């Protein structure tokens, strides 16, 4: 029934670089770190993203953030009444701060997110994510 065949002739063994000539090892790969970042990135894809632009007042932006996982995400815990964020009305508790002035805060370190949020000025440009209905 079979229409294929196989070869009984000897097998040809061509040579190839050794381990000394060709170092195929790669210790740079870090699946644990990448996976932590990727999980945060997955949640954002499922979120409703909208732009927001706030002008800083005397009190600042009137927002309190919390980090949630190392690789963290930035979420709003408090919107101070009378602050810029509340008076705008588009930012609510549990909103994720996906981007700030064009810099992504998804799966970042606390040190990175703090540096970015401390360097904001005046009219800050936000990308906000909210859970879809």
């Amino acid at each position: 029934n079979r229409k294929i065949k196989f070869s009984s002739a000897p097998i040809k063994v061509f040579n190839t670089y050794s381990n000394e000539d060709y170092d195929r090892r790669n210790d740079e790969v870090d699946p644990v770190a990448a996976s932590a970042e990727y999980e945060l990135e997955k949640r954002v894809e499922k979120l409703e993203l909208f732009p927001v632009e706030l002008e800083k007042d005397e009190d600042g932006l009137g927002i309190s953030i919390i980090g949630m996982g190392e690789k963290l995400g930035i979420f709003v815990k408090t919107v101070t009444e009378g602050g810029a964020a509340q008076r705008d009305g588009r930012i609510q508790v549990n909103d994720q701060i996906v981007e700030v002035d064009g810099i992504s805060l998804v799966g970042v370190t606390q040190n990175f997110a703090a540096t970015v949020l401390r360097n904001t000025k005046g009219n800050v440009r936000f990308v906000i994510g909210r859970e879809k209905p």
Partner: protein, 298 residues
Amino acid sequence: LNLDSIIGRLLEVQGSRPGKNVQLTENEIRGLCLKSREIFLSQPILLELEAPLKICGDIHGQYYDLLRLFEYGGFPPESNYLFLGDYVDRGKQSLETICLLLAYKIKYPENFFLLRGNHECASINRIYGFYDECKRRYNIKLWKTFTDCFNCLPIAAIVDEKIFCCHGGLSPDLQSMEQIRRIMRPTDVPDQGLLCDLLWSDPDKDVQGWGENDRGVSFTFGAEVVAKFLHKHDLDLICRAHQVVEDGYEFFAKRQLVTLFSAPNYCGEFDNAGAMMSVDETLMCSFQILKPQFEMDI
């Protein structure tokens, strides 16, 4: 396009010490992705190929091994080629590997073919190297571009209506080939289903029927499942990859299934050799072995 220029630069490092990179421009790579993507969608998701042909397994960014693979097997179009996926991840030169393969596909669309491995998926290569390699040497936008190209790779190939080819293996959901052909592209690889199993499943001698896969995804299948599969569809061999075999090749269930792996000393942690499969006009099959939590007010 610069296609001849791109290939020439990629082959210029043949005689150098392994590890030397070839840095193509962002636009050249994007061209290769957008044009190979166009070809992939113009060709069937289930390939119907005819001999002669040479079949190769995983590469995983071991670019110079791919060159020696081509050097001994004959650079295209001297020989027709079919790869079973896993071109990226775990190696230091995935970008060179996938660019050379995509270039040849554009140059020789009817004589050079690439199948989708489990590592040609965003959820996987985001973790095991390709995303990092794209971020370091280009931008992540280029990685998204590779994702759109990978999402259109063909899944399986049938050679001469008798040899069935795919990266992983069989699926318990696979009754007719029309289930494969109905798969629409571009598509991600789901965590479960037919497409998942074709890219992930493994043969296992110690399993009767189907069993859970130690990888945490898809299944394992025994020899009886192979024999019944070949009988039902009038095939005589299953050719696949996705597992390291010490001799570059390894048979399963007598001669009804073969596993190919073309990345010698896989990521520098194995001793294994690489191998390929040559099929002639008379469907003779032979083996060539390539042996060496926080808060803040704003």
